[PDB]
Amino acid sequence: ARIFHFNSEVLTSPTMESTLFKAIQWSKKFGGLIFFDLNLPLPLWRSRNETRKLIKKSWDEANIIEVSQQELEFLLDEEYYERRRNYTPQYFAEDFEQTKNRRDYYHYTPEEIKPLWHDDLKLLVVTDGTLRLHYYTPKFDGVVVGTEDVLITPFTCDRTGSGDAVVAGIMRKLTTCPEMFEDQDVLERQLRFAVAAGIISQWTIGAVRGFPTESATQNLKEQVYVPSMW
Amino acid sequence: GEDATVDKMCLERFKVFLKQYNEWVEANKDRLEEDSYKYDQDFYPGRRIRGK
Incomplete structure (x- = not known):
């Protein structure tokens, strides 16, 4: 295996946690990359400090990390970013775009992310659903703009499992397009494939029942994005 | 000219005001800035100049 993937649910079990770090040792010895898909279970949302201590060892072993926007803000400071979203200028907007009262898609600076960065980390992806994919590398950072349409099918829409399809789409492109780690333009084009898979x-109702095929995902990507973004 | 230097003028009553004013400024400067932040979210002409 070239990518070893696990979630933080294994950290809630004493047996699995010991087994997990033997598996990581073996995978690294054979050159595999470690993918940590956080997906915090219910207990790990209790307090930031307990969770940061609990995940720190597995966080440091990972080469690729995917977190949601809510998980990232919880791990750094939940109240600071909520206050930041709720701020409204008193007299006039600082720029014309601030007048439109649009949804907040704040892109975290690499200095805000610095407490979570380590030496072996190659790619950090922060997902705002399928709407935004913020990516961070040692050399560069940026955001991929996505979209969602569940109102196109109000009676079959079900968001469960869409996070897994995005992660699977990242893993599909990482293994076949290794330049993603070093080329920003290539990384953004390949991440749009992961956006389409999430959409x-x-x-479909049910995660497994609704997981898409490659040709369907590639078709949707070319329909949604203008040809220069493919 | 030389007859209109500051030491030649009677400003004794204004100097006592300056002494009281400076004592008030040193004791209330920080409280006034704190109240500006508590009450006025953004700066605007006419508000208290604060920060840098």
Whole structure:
């Protein structure tokens, strides 16, 4: 295996945690990359400090990390970012775009992310659903703009499992397009494939039942994005 | 000219005001800035100049 993938649910079990770090040792010895898909279970949302201590060892072993926007803000400071979203200028907007009262898609600076960065980390992806994919590398950072349409099918839409389709789409492109780690333009084009997979996954009841095929995902990507973004 | 230097003028009553004013400024400067932040979210002309 070239990518070893695990979630933080294994950290809630004493047996699995010991087994997990033997598996990581073996995978690294054979050159595999470690993918940590956080997906915090219910207990790990209790307090930031307890969770940061609990995940720190597995966080440091990972080469690729995927977190949601809510998980990232919880791990750094939940109240600071909520206050930041709720701020409204008193007299006039600082720029014309601030007048439109649009949804907040704040892109975290690499200095805000610095407490969570380590030496072996190659790619950090922060997902705002399928709407935004913020990516961070040692050399560069940026955001991929996505979209969602569950109102196109109000009676079959079900968001469960769409996070897994996005992660699977990242893993599909990482293994076959290794320049993603070093080329920003290539990384953004390949991540749009992961966005499309997440979108389709939300159109069916049931996670496994609705997971999309490669040709369907590639078709949707070319329909949604203008040809220069493919 | 030389007859209109500051030491030649009677400003004794204004100097006592300056002494009281400076004592008030040193004791209330920080409280006034704190109240500006508590009450006025953004700066605007006419508000208290604060920060840097």
